[PDB]
Amino acid sequence: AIIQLPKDFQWGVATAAYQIEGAYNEDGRGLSIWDTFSHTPGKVRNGDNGDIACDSYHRYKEDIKLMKELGVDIYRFSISWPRIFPTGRGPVNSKGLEFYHHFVDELIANGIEPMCTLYHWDLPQSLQDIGGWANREVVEAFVEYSTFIFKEFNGKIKKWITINEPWCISFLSNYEGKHAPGNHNLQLAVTISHHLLLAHGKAVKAFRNLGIEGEIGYAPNVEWIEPFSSKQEDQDACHRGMGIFIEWFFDPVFKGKYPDFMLDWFEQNGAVPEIQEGDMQMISQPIDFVGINFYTGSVGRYNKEAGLLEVEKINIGYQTTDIGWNIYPEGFYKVLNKINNQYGNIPIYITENGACYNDEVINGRVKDEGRIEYLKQHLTSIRRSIETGVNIKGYFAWSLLDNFEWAEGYDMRFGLVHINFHTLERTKKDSYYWYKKIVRNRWFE
Template identity: 60%
Template sequence: MPIIKFPDGFKWGTATAAYQIEGAAFENGRGLSIWDTFSHTPGKVKNGDTGDIACDSYHRYEEDIELLAQMGVKVYRFSVSWPRIFPNGRGGLNPEGLRYYDNLINKLVDKGIEPMLTLYHWDLPQALQDQGGWANRETVDAFSHYAETVFKEFNGKVNYWQTINEPLCAAFLSNYYGVHAPGYKDLQVAIDVSHNLLLAHGRAVRLFRELGIEGKIGTATNTTWREPFSNKKEDTEACKREIGLNIDWFLDPIFKGRYPCYLVKWFKQKGVELPIADGDMEAIQQPIDFIGVNYYSGNIARYKEDTGLLDIENIEINYEHTYIGWPIYADGLHKVFHYLNDRYGNVPLFVTENGACCIDEMVNGKVADWDRIRYYEQHLTAVSRAIESGINIIGYLAWSLMDNFEWAEGYGKRFGLVYVDFSTLERTKKDSYYWYKKVIANGWMEI
């Protein structure tokens, strides 16, 4: 069998998000988030599921860190719950919230695991949403204060920092398609939110530099790939729009100080204007240390008029799909790496999310998720190909450590390396856990 090797010092790990795993939604001073409100609204989340308990990692974090340690991971990416720190979004600091994350981080460091802290993974304090949420520029000021508090509290303990997770989802899934909290369907609001998220990112990075915080800082961007069905101009432009809304819209302002002209023109044709104020683009264009790459799927696609926001139609060509319905298209990840490298230069890339939703069944105390293992094999091969081609990829984080609250899908879609019985909260290592542990230990895999 062929052997795929990875560089010495490659950063192996896994990732989670606060609302998806912590639970303890109403304990120890935590305020409401938009996901508390959304999940408790009938019809918004499948089966009426909520994150009230989730995986109960708030109380079981030591057990979960032990799972990480036994796996041999080098990096653990988690997010801080903003309403656990500031229950109302601003003012009124909750010391119990800071204490929880301090205990978590200390335990990770004790186990030799580098913390990667994400400041915002979608759980906006509801009190701020009541004042307009991310569409209100004052939320950017509140985020800056929150970020400064977290920076100062954990300076010297965290090696990797991320500002905003998947701004495409926080802007468009949440405010245009309406499938994520707060559930709006307004394109202008989505555009306003996307800009303010970028502004919040830029101000946080600038604060990070001004305060002299230790470590490296970046963002975590949605990525996908669309291969044109033909070489017709309309097909290539449709695919460019799909790739670009994921990548260019959120990274061009950071690296080039401007939004991509072709998408600005596209949105203007739909009657939407960018809410750019003086100094905004300069604030956004702050140097970052790495790009976080979140990739799950891609497709072949072509132009089709009046199809969705971008006039694009996916063409399924006998792809296998994960249980959530996404095509398995590992070559798309390889192409994303080259696209990022060509567009933004040799910026270090860190795969901060990649994984598969599978039908996981417990049989005789075991979960034989070989379909997930195959997914990882395909995508890690794409990572290796890019590294061998000279692209600077510094690490890979599997999504996710454990099964969890999968947003609007509730608990019916599992991505974890660890199986969670949501009635007992018992954790069980899947076959993919043991496979990934071996890859980490060896620094290579057989395919």
């Protein structure tokens, strides 16, 4: 069966600063909460950290050459906030600011549009010292940082993401404690989630006010959770299971409200977001597009002992990637429909989609056919979604390079390009060559 993507469909790859850059204490860069966290005993598998990573701070021209051969239209990357403002505020670090000027200019020189994520989890440790995202001064510090970057790049970067995956920044980082800074407190996570939406809306209003050229959105991750049965308790369990990703972070942006079923559930569990007057009006700024990060899904069954949301996620027969995530391309199609039906025809970029497969170099080749199959399946769901009328503009494969995968360290590879983390040698995988052909041909079988 032939799958054909539209002529105007945009192809990209995506990375994040702390995951690839390295040079963590060079050219004036201050520490982030992920520097602190990954050097804390027991927080990252194998004691990995992002001190060196792929060393893409230095080798960014070698990485840009990889992308021109690949043929992508857009490159999604992030800016390290503590590389621009080592303390989060105050004096600009000139070497860090010029690094991204050299990068963006060389990108455009090679014919690649930049898409910039302002915040991809590397909060300056100086700001975490005063409470981090729990402190509304850090929200303001984000606006001032974004404003600096907007003005600094108004000619060159025309696609912008404020906050990447606020669900991870808040709940995964401050309730489950698995990501930096590693707290375990539901009320704190609930309030931090509100502050991230506030930081986003303020960054958006700044973008408008200053008349920056281009378009701006944010990049939530979402899952599809299919009800185990028609029983109401299973329907509600899945409503909650997806609502923590979708309604909780989309309703404030699109409808100016938090969903009542989530508010009531949180309240029964002792948490209420601390909303100050004018917050909701500031959150609900109009955005140009939404970035969807999608990897996985499941079937959900009500179970009173299944965590806070009381939903048991069941693998009813999916393949899994090497990090253990269900492969559920039909869920991808369904979740995009859910979003289109609830929030309208807003433009959508798939700002992340990819698979962990830990395939090694053998005779100079990486035979990662599992990754090719994953990409085929999710690009098929995107084609189905476009035909159903979802306003999908492009696709970013996660990731260009194998990189530092947060609490999993270097052992969980997502790249199209293999990285020897001892030698920093790059090796194009089979999926790189496949993606290259698909980006050019715009069809596959």
